Structure formats: structure tokens, C-alpha cells
Amino acid sequence: RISNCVADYSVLYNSASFSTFKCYGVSPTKLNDLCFTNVYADSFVIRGD
Amino acid sequence: EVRQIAPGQTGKIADYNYKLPDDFTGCVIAWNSNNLDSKGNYNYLYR
């Protein structure tokens, strides 16, 4: 859980080290301006297919 | 970037050097050129 901080989504997006980075409810460009209440990052490993 | 070069598609190269309009009408063709450009090719570039 991430809270009580300022997130520079612009840096993360410009730091395009990821192959596929898509949001199904938001547009990546609008992320930097938009603000969120609760942010939860779920990390794991899967297969390409 | 084949996906990136397409209407309503974004990417690192897209929006920086070439961005198709959504309303445009046309065709796009892409293919592998490893054999043709096989020896990197610093003549190729990306800003």
C-alpha cells in the first residue's frame, strides 16, 4: 500500500522500461494530473501467454 | 512499435517522431528487415 506521498507518474511513464503498460479505467497521459486516494501495488510473476 | 504506429496508439517512439491521425484513411505495412540490414546500424536513430 502506498499513501501519504507524492507520486511522479510522469517520471515512471517516461522511464519506459516496461513492455506493456496499459490502464483499463484511465489514460496514461492523464495519470500525472489525476490524483488517487488508495494505491495498492500487487507484484508477482506469470507466463507470457 | 507496430502497435504504436496505428490510430489511437501510443508509445515511446510514438508522439515523439510519428503519430497517425485517428480520422486518417490509409494502409500500414510492416515487415522484418533483419536479413536485409544484417551486418549496430547507428545510421538508424530514435529521438
Method: cryo-EM
Say whether residue A16 is in contact with chain B using an 8 A CB cutoff: yes
CB spacing of A16 vs B10 below 8 angstroms: no
CB spacing of B10 vs A28 below 8 angstroms: yes
Give phi and psi for A6, each to the nearest 5: -120, 125
3 state DSSP class of A49 = coil
Give phi and psi for A29, each to the nearest 5: -65, -40
Alpha helices, DSSP H, located in chain A: 9-14, 28-31
- Residue ranges of B 2-21 with Cβ closer than 8 A to chain A: 10-12
Answer yes or no: are the C-beta atoms of B7 and B25 closer than 8 Å. Answer: no
